[PDB]
């Protein structure tokens, strides 16, 4: 560890690693700090689901997720426990228990909001779904020129997609995937298009997908090394970044105050360029700790001078969920090309197809897989092979269906894992809404309570807006009920429901992007630079100022690439 | 990865790590293979609970545990789901689903039994409780000389305790720990002693304990290196070990069959010495897959010729659990030295005590801690400080109370963490019973069903022996109800219950030790050498042939230490 | 029709459940493996609790039930009395 | 006839129930029979069902019915947690 780098990056998630990739590559002296630690194995910041053991027990990985989602603001509990023994100590009031947040209104919270503090952040557990936003969901990068704005986004997404190894072909050979994808394509003929979810992942075998992460973007090894002898990069885990120090003029950052968690010592680090990519919650916390915006419960009598839109216009997506059990008709359509005779397990039992026949509904690879499973496992009443991969289906956001969809099997299950129904039959449904940015919807930080790292306690003041947001959220719910029904009836224990506000972890707009700080009520410009500040940049979904339903990360990355370009154009690397 | 090694060790758990420490240190060329992969961070095989994040968020670690406990034998499920939509495909029978084990009788199972496949094994998540066994639970290392037996065990235990860094004072400054322990010793009026659970751990600060693990025993770094230039060690993760090749006379092992899970390739690896430390389940599986004992459902009247006691006499402990809410009486006593005036939160309120007053029931440092908490947080109605450590109390197994006890807070929570009751009030109780070895209690492996790694499927045939084991189990439950009531009544939602059989993961006796293969119905001698084989040693809790209630790992390690002494006496390390 | 139920409509679910006796309960196959070791424990899923060994659990009307009180089920019914249109009607 | 524990955290004035009922095609395979060995509590032959909702129009309509309740109920408000759309026991 030196005291002077060219660039300091706060956060080793995939957005901090986008900045590391671009700047370590362009030959800057780069430092990166994460409050969390290295755990994912020898590949630093890698996806935790890439072990052989998880690929053979996909059902277990829900635990890894839950292990690293630390709630952001837990309100005070008011459940009444009146079956305590008379000898047991019993409250007189509903006092602040268990580090809960006294500032938090329970009825205006994002209870499901949570943060991950591990090297590689949330990209160590994420689903890897990486769709682009269409214009309606998307911030403008060029005004008064739609083709040029389209042009700019298409170049940035293509590069981002490249970093993530995004693709749409990894599940092309799955029976469940094709079955579900097929039905939907037919039921919505002329109304909606379906495709495989664009996934940041590369298939290595029929039973192993290598999921992308921050590690895929930047491998997080210290440089130089044999492989990159001309590069300079250091990662510093177990270091809390607490403040960036403003000059009085509010035109530069002077240093980064860090707290080393192992030794306990606090240090000041100098950079030319300061990049904050600590997540949509923790960027904002860090800026408010540094004198931006306002600390404490909002006071509209006294709005802040510096960055007054900070932690206002926050957006979170509504999320609906269910599971279905495959319809008998769909199960039967799996074997529509077969001539089946006799009874399974009985001497006369016969399953045949004509390869290549004109009347066939399925390709041969399909019918070969089904015929062999049906003949070789006559104890099993289904035509789907045991290790057939799950579906990965979406119909993407459009004006007539303004929500994102994911259909398949997500590793983030929400209830106890049920065993009485065959997993081959189960399909998950997650629809995500777009939330209108409104000034009243706030992420603020307490001037009295602190969190576990002795930083001001995050508090939400949030309701989904009563108008179009709420109407769309309910229409979205009905749409999932309508659509899922095409595949099968609901699985009991996983009936259609809205998830806890924020469980979906797509918070944006906490440090929002736009052209003009005042006119567009924002905090950063289109180079991701904090207005007024020559050398302070924010990356992540906190930048995204629009109402979006699709998963944000690729859009964030896309903004971070544009932001690296401005840095390469305006700061010179130190000579070796 | 070479053709040939002095020693190969299967399994990188703490026991395999005991062999690596001893044999690498003694100059042998050591290879160690683990089916799982590196995932504890840069300290290979280290406890996953040693992150700052987990020590600030101890309730989340239950998820890390659950994520890596993969159930051993799951029977076929027979739950009726009759609220499916009429359109959903519906079972006509309870067919084999979701990888269940059709050999498994659901009513003679250890359903809670589970395995961990990661480098460092279960030591990456364990509670680090390392009690010694008293004579009554301890297998003999010397017959007919209780003095030499004792001194042998004292010496092996003292060594294992330093390897693990066991100690008994890391929690001595907790108010809760002391409140609970003092009240118990008062109430038992001499009949039983309460102490700190001996813990493999080192305290680093008032808020961080470096838990021990495999890595504390042996750091698992490849060697030679700068810190050990004369040593020789390679770890090969993601390598499934499948067979040891016996010579036909059953007097030696010739090679070990391995499957490289990344490349898919298979190799036979040669060494002078072969050490199986794959766990109590997997050592037996590997051995059975190699022609020892009997593959398939046990057949009485066909008995195996080679190690006929392998997989018989299995033991698993009964585990009872509850939590309590601390008594008003105990909460009042924490503050018994205080003069308290006025009402909390008024300008009038004050809490004082006299330091050094001879009538004080508590030391100054306690009273200081209570005073500060009570004066600095007058919103809080409890006298216990916010990050006061949990209790870590035990009364150790004895003949008139033949079960091990642990009282405090265990990371491995068994239901949803409740938020209505303050955590400072909650104390956990786990009592562990001892199970008679009986021949009918079997771990065996299917000759038709295979597991996730294509190895014969583990199947249990187990009931708690009627008679002593079962009478003690129930007296144990009653003892927990009786003892726990001294501290507080039960916490609703954590009422006194037996846990699922084998949830406690203290399986023993699957490859058990004894003097004489026939007379003692066993598999390994007191050097942990498999009878008749020059160069095959088994390590782990599977060696332990006795009825025990204490946590078995320190004992298993002590035996390994004895086994390594045999090795250094009978194999020369190769020239460097 | 009592004053007390008209003032506590929420309670009347209990009167209903009190007089719906299941018609055919199949044999239970739930596995209770946290019984104490001293407690008597089945070796098989035998016919318990008057359940019906003849009943296929997967081809049942489990929710079917009968009321044996004077006035039968009309002592608790919802009183909804629509006519069938031709398509529903004999 | 409520089906789950009575919830109190939401005002009863806001709660609306939805029950949609399907028509079932009569099929010969769907039977109510009586055991010649087991008896019920009045020493009469034990009722046994052999029943599945017919795979064709009955089942299609039942699922369309479910979707119809989801579509229609939405006009009034969102689902109450603990009373999410579900098929009741047959
Ligand atoms: C957890 C989760 C997340 C996503 C999906 C599923 C689940 C279970 N699936 C997924 C997501 N997004 C996608 O677009 N597609 C989907 O398939 N999920 C969200 C996604 O995972 C995030 O949007 C993404 O990582 C955001 O990246 P980022 O902006 O780089 O932020 P991270 O949270 O990954 O990393 C931040 C980081 O910095 C640290 N930190 C925080 N505060 C500090 C301070 N004060 N000092 C130092 N370091 C700090 C963290 O520890 C962390 O590593
Ligand atoms: C999970 C757990 C277990 C312990 C406690 C708490 C919980 C939640 N706490 C506890 C324990 N015991 C104590 O003595 N005190 C306590 O506080 N727990 C049990 C303890 O953790 C085990 O007894 C101990 O690890 C056993 O050590 P081991 O004999 O070294 O075996 P492990 O299972 O840890 O490691 C085995 C290992 O080998 C692998 N494996 C399995 N099969 C193969 C094959 N075929 N090839 C290659 N490698 C194989 C594993 O992947 C593993 O790492
Ligand atoms: C319980 C229930 C029932 C109905 C609704 C709600 C609930 C909770 N709501 C309702 C109904 N039907 C409507 O059209 N609209 C709705 O709003 N429910 C059903 C309705 O309640 C029944 O369809 C109706 O009573 C049928 O009348 P029934 O054909 O007269 O049959 P009952 O079951 O009322 O009375 C039969 C009767 O005879 C007895 N019994 C049975 N076996 C014997 C023998 N062997 N010996 C002598 N007596 C016998 C009974 O004890 C009973 O009183
Ligand atoms: O709740 C899980 C969901 O979380 C979201 O963060 C992801 O973007 C989705 F892919 C995922 O299915
Ligand atoms: O189930 C958790 C328990 O599991 C056991 O393996 C441990 O030995 C105990 F320490 C622990 O409390």
Of the candidates A336, A365, A388, which is a domain's last residue?
Answer: A388
Closest CA to A556 of A535, A537, A542: A542
CA distances from B89 to A187, A326, B92, B385 (A): 19, 6, 10, 56
Structure tokens at A136: 């309606």
Kindly give the pairing relationship between strand A114-115 and strand B70-71: unpaired
Number of B–D residue contacts, CB under 8 Å? 23
Exposed e or buried b per residue across C63-79, where buried means at least 16 C-beta atoms within 10 angstroms of its C-beta: ebbebeeeeeeeebeee
Whether the Cβ atoms of residue A63 and residue A54 lie closer than 8 Å to each other: no
What is the distance between the alpha carbons of residues A15 and A559, in angstroms, rounded to a whole number?
9
Q: What is the dihedral of CA B238, B240, B246, B251, to 10 degrees?
A: 60
C79 marked as binding residue: yes
Q: What is the largest CA-CA distance in chain C?
A: 64
CA distances from A340 to A344, B167, B192, B195, D54 (A): 10, 69, 72, 70, 22
Protein residue whose Cα sits closest to atom 12 of ligand 4:
A410
Length of chain D: 90
Protein residue whose Cα sits closest to atom 46 of ligand 3:
C68
C-beta atoms of C50 and D35 within 8 A: no
Query: For residue A566, how many other CB atoms are within 10 A of its CB?
Result: 15
Burial class (CB in 10 A: 0-12, 13-18, 19+), D15: exposed
Query: For residue A86, how many other CB atoms are within 10 A of its CB?
Result: 8
Exposed e or buried b per residue across A132-153, where buried means at least 16 C-beta atoms within 10 angstroms of its C-beta: bbeeebbbbbeeeeeeebeebb
Do B311 and B352 fall into the same domain? no
What is the distance between the alpha carbons of residues A565 and A528, in angstroms, rounded to a whole number?
11
Ligand 4 mutation target, pool A64, A110, A115, A126, most atoms within 8 A of CB: A126
Structure tokens at B110: 């250890």
What is the distance between the alpha carbons of residues B314 and B502, in angstroms, rounded to a whole number?
11
Closest CA to A496 of A557, A442, A450, A429: A429
Q: Is the CB of A16 under 6 A from ligand 1?
A: yes
Q: At what angle do helices B175-188 and B364-376 cross, to 10 degrees?
A: 130
Residue B363's domain comprises 327-388
Structure tokens at A432: 């995500």
Residue A556: helix, strand or coil by DSSP?
A: helix
What is the distance between the alpha carbons of residues A480 and A484, in angstroms, rounded to a whole number?
6
Q: How far does C22 lie from chain D, in Å, by closest CA?
A: 10
Give CB contacts under 8 A, 24+ apart, made by B269-272: B269/B1, B269/B3, B269/B4, B269/B5, B269/B8, B269/B31, B269/B33, B270/B3, B270/B4, B270/B5, B271/B4, B271/B5, B271/B6, B271/B7, B271/B8, B271/B31, B272/B5, B272/B6, B272/B7, B272/B535, B272/B571, B272/B574
Do B94 and B148 fall into the same domain? yes
Residue B491: HSE in the Cβ half-sphere, 13 Å Cα cutoff: 25
Of the candidates A336, A360, A388, which is a domain's last residue?
Answer: A388
Distance between Cα B112 and ligand 2 center (Å): 15
CA distances from B1 to A460, B237, B239, B267, B278 (A): 55, 12, 12, 10, 20
Would you give the end-to-end CA distance of chain C in angstroms?
A: 33
Whether the Cβ atoms of residue B318 and residue B469 lie closer than 8 Å to each other: yes
Kindly give the pairing relationship between strand A404-408 and strand A392-394: antiparallel
What is the distance between the alpha carbons of residues B408 and B311, in angstroms, rounded to a whole number?
34
Q: 């590997």: which residue's tokens? A: B286
Q: What is the dihedral of CA A369, A373, A374, A376, to 10 degrees?
A: 130
Burial class (CB in 10 A: 0-12, 13-18, 19+), B257: middle
The DSSP result for B445-482, as a single string, is EEEEEE-TTSSEEEEEE--PPTTHHHHHHHHHHHHHHH
Q: Enumerate the H helices of A402-509 as residue ranges.
A: 468-484
Cis check for the bond before A224: say yes or no (omega within 30 of 0): yes
Q: What is the dihedral of CA B515, B517, B520, B521, to 10 degrees?
A: 150
Burial class (CB in 10 A: 0-12, 13-18, 19+), B350: middle
What is the distance between the alpha carbons of residues C7 and C14, in angstroms, rounded to a whole number?
15
What is the distance between the alpha carbons of residues B296 and B309, in angstroms, rounded to a whole number?
15
Cα angle for residues B184, B188, B190 (degrees, 5° grid): 120
Cα angle for residues B229, B233, B236 (degrees, 5° grid): 140
Q: At what angle do helices A146-164 and A14-25 cross, to 10 degrees?
A: 90
Do A367 and A461 fall into the same domain? no
Q: What is the dihedral of CA A76, A81, A82, A87, to 10 degrees?
A: -100
Query: For residue A516, how many other CB atoms are within 10 A of its CB?
Result: 10
Give bridge partners of residue B255 from the DSSP assignment: B245
Q: What is the largest CA-CA distance in chain D?
A: 53
Whether the Cβ atoms of residue B551 and residue B2 lie closer than 8 Å to each other: no
DSSP code of residue B421? S
Q: Chain C contacts of B93, Cβ < 8 Å? A: 58
Closest CA to A387 of A371, A363, A369: A369
Length of chain B: 576
CA distances from A446 to A45, A99, A281, A295 (A): 31, 14, 13, 6
A413: left (phi over 0), alpha (psi -120 to 50) or beta: beta
Length of chain A: 576
Structure tokens at B209: 């304990």
Ligand 1 mutation target, pool A503, A553, A556, most atoms within 8 A of CB: A553
Q: How far does D11 lie from chain C, in Å, by closest CA?
A: 13
CA distances from B186 to A371, B16, B193, B194, B358 (A): 73, 42, 10, 10, 20
Do B220 and B304 fall into the same domain? yes
Residue D52: helix, strand or coil by DSSP?
A: coil
Closest CA to A18 of A159, A122, A142: A159
Do B22 and B170 fall into the same domain? yes
**Kind and range of the H or E element at C21?**
strand C21-22
CATH of the domain at B364: 3.30.1920.50
Give CB contacts under 8 A, 24+ apart, made by D44-48: D46/C24, D46/C52, D46/C54, D47/C23, D47/C24, D47/C52, D48/C24, D48/C52, D48/C54, D48/C55
Specify the resolution in Å. 1.9
Structure tokens at A340: 């089946």
What is the distance between the alpha carbons of residues A571 and A562, in angstroms, rounded to a whole number?
15
Measured CB to CB, residues of chain C less than 8 Å from chain D are 10, 13, 16, 23-24, 50, 52-56, 59-64, 78, 88
Whether the Cβ atoms of residue C24 and residue D49 lie closer than 8 Å to each other: yes
What is the distance between the alpha carbons of residues B65 and B13, in angstroms, rounded to a whole number?
15
Structure tokens at A524: 């950063």
Structure tokens at D66: 């479910």
Give bridge partners of residue A236 from the DSSP assignment: A33
Q: Is the CB of C16 under 6 A from ligand 3?
A: yes
C-to-N gaps above 2.5 Å in chain B, after residues: none
Mapped to the 3 state alphabet, what secondary structure does B15-64 carry? HHHHHHHHHHHCCCEEEEEECCCCCCCCCCCCCCCCCHHHHHCHHHHHHH
Where are the strands (E) in B206-277, listed by range?
A: 208-211, 232-237, 239-246, 253-260, 266-276
Residues 6+ apart with CB under 8 A from B474: C36, C37, C38
Give bridge partners of residue A490 from the DSSP assignment: A324
Which chains have 3 or more CB–CB distances shorter than 8 Å to chain D? A, B, C
C69 marked as binding residue: yes
Do B152 and B192 fall into the same domain? yes
C-beta atoms of A497 and D84 within 8 A: yes
Do B57 and B119 fall into the same domain? yes
Residues 6+ apart with CB under 8 A from B189: none
What is the distance between the alpha carbons of residues B427 and B388, in angstroms, rounded to a whole number?
13
CA distances from A381 to A330, B318, B452 (A): 14, 38, 21
Query: For residue C14, how many other CB atoms are within 10 A of its CB?
Result: 10
Q: 């009282």: which residue's tokens? A: B407
Measured CB to CB, residues of chain B less than 8 Å from chain D are 82-87, 90
Kindly give the pairing relationship between strand B70-71 and strand A442-450: unpaired
**Kind and range of the H or E element at A163?**
helix A146-164
Whether the Cβ atoms of residue B341 and residue B350 lie closer than 8 Å to each other: yes
Closest CA to C21 of B160, B368, D46, A103: D46
Whether the Cβ atoms of residue D61 and residue D53 lie closer than 8 Å to each other: no
Whether the Cβ atoms of residue A544 and residue A508 lie closer than 8 Å to each other: yes
What is the distance between the alpha carbons of residues B495 and A85, in angstroms, rounded to a whole number?
12
Do A243 and A300 fall into the same domain? yes
Do B264 and B344 fall into the same domain? no
Length of chain C: 90
The number of domains in chain A is 2
**Kind and range of the H or E element at B153?**
helix B146-164
C-beta atoms of B500 and C44 within 8 A: no
Mapped to the 3 state alphabet, what secondary structure does A270-291 carry? ECCEEEECCCHHHHHHHHHHCC
Q: Is the CB of C83 under 6 A from ligand 3?
A: no
Do A321 and A333 fall into the same domain? no
CA distances from A485 to A196, A391, A496 (A): 19, 16, 11
What is the distance between the alpha carbons of residues A139 and D54, in angstroms, rounded to a whole number?
52
Do B134 and B259 fall into the same domain? yes
Backbone angles phi, psi at B232, to 5 degrees: -135, 110
Q: What is the largest CA-CA distance in chain B?
A: 88
CA distances from A273 to A536, A563, B432 (A): 6, 12, 58
Structure tokens at B386: 């916010």
Instruction: Let me know if A47 is a catalytic residue.
Output: no
Q: Ligand 4, closest atom to CA A499?
A: 1
Of the candidates A388, A405, A431, which is a domain's last residue?
Answer: A388
Q: What is the CA radius of gyration of chain B?
A: 26
Mapped to the 3 state alphabet, what secondary structure does A343-378 carry? CCCCCCCEEECCCCCCCCCCCHHHHHHHHHHHHHCC
Do B322 and B382 fall into the same domain? no
What is the distance between the alpha carbons of residues A228 and A232, in angstroms, rounded to a whole number?
9
Can you count the helices (H) and strands (E) in chain B?
11, 23
What is the distance between the alpha carbons of residues B288 and B281, in angstroms, rounded to a whole number?
11
What is the distance between the alpha carbons of residues B38 and B238, in angstroms, rounded to a whole number?
9
């Amino acid at each position: 560890m030196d005291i002077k780098y060219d660039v300091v990056i706060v956060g080793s998630g995939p957005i901090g690693c986008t900045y590391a990739r671009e700047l370590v590559g362009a030959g800057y002296k780069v430092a990166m700090f994460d409050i969390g630690e290295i755990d994912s194995g020898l590949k630093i910041g890698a996806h935790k689901k890439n072990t052989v053991e998880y690929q053979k027990n996909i059902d277990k990985f829900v635990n890894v997720i839950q292990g690293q989602l630390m709630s952001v603001s837990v309100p005070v509990n008011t459940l009444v426990v009146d079956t305590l023994s008379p000898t047991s100590w019993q409250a007189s009031t509903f006092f602040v228990r268990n580090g809960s947040n006294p500032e938090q209104d329970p009825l205006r919270n994002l209870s499901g909001q949570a943060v991950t503090r591990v090297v590689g952040g949330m990209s160590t557990h994420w689903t890897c779904a990486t769709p682009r936003f269409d214009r309606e969901q998307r911030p403008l990068l060029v005004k008064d020129d739609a083709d040029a704005d389209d042009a700019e986004w298409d170049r940035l997404y293509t590069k981002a997609e490249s970093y993530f190894q995004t693709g749409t072909d990894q599940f092309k050979e799955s029976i469940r995937h094709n079955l579900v994808l097929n039905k939907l394509t037919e039921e919505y003929k002329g109304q909606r298009d379906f495709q495989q979810i664009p996934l940041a992942a590369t298939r290595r075998s029929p039973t192993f997908v290598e999921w992308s992460s921050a590690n895929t973007v930047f491998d997080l090894q210290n440089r130089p090394n044999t492989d990159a002898p001309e590069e300079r990069f250091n990662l510093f885990p177990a270091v809390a970044c607490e403040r960036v120090v403003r000059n009085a003029l509010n035109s530069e950052i002077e240093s980064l105050h860090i707290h080393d968690l192992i030794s306990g010592d606090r240090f000041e680090i100098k950079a030319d360029v300061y990049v904050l990519t600590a997540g949509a919650v923790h960027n904002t916390q860090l800026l408010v700790n540094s004198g931006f915006g306002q600390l404490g419960r909002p006071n509209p009598a006294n709005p802040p001078e510096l960055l007054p839109s900070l932690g206002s216009y926050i957006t979170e997506q509504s999320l609906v969920f269910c599971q279905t059990v495959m319809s008998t008709e769909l199960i039967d359509s799996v074997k529509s090309d077969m001539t089946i005779r006799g009874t399974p397990g009985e001497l006369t039992y016969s399953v045949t197809y004509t390869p290549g026949a004109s009347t066939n509904k399925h390709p041969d690879w399909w019918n070969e897989k089904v015929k062999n499973h049906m003949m070789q496992h006559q104890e099993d009443p289904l035509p789907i092979p045991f290790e057939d991969p799950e579906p990965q289906v979406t119909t993407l956001f459009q004006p007539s269906h303004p929500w994102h969809t994911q259909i398949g099997r997500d590793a983030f299950s929400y209830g106890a894992v049920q065993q009485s129904i065959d997993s081959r039959l189960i399909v998950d449904w997650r629809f995500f809404g777009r939330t209108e940015p409104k000034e009243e919807n706030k992420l603020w930080f307490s001037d009295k309570i602190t969190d576990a790292y002795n930083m001001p306690q995050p508090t939400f003041d949030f309701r989904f807006p009563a108008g179009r947001t709420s109407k769309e959220a309910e229409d979205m719910m009905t749409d999932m009920c309508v659509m899922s029904a095409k595949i099968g009836g609901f699985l009991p224990g996983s009936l259609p429901q809205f998830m806890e506000p924020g469980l979906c972890l797509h918070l944006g707009g906490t440090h929002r992007m736009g052209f003009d700080e005042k006119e567009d009520n924002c905090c950063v410009n289109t180079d991701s630079r904090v207005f007024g500040f020559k050398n302070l940049f924010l990356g992540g979904c906190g930048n995204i100022p629009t109402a979006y339903g699709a998963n944000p990360t690729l859009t964030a990355m896309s903004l971070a690439i544009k932001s690296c370009e401005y840095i390469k154009q305006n700061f010179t690397p130190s000579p070796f």
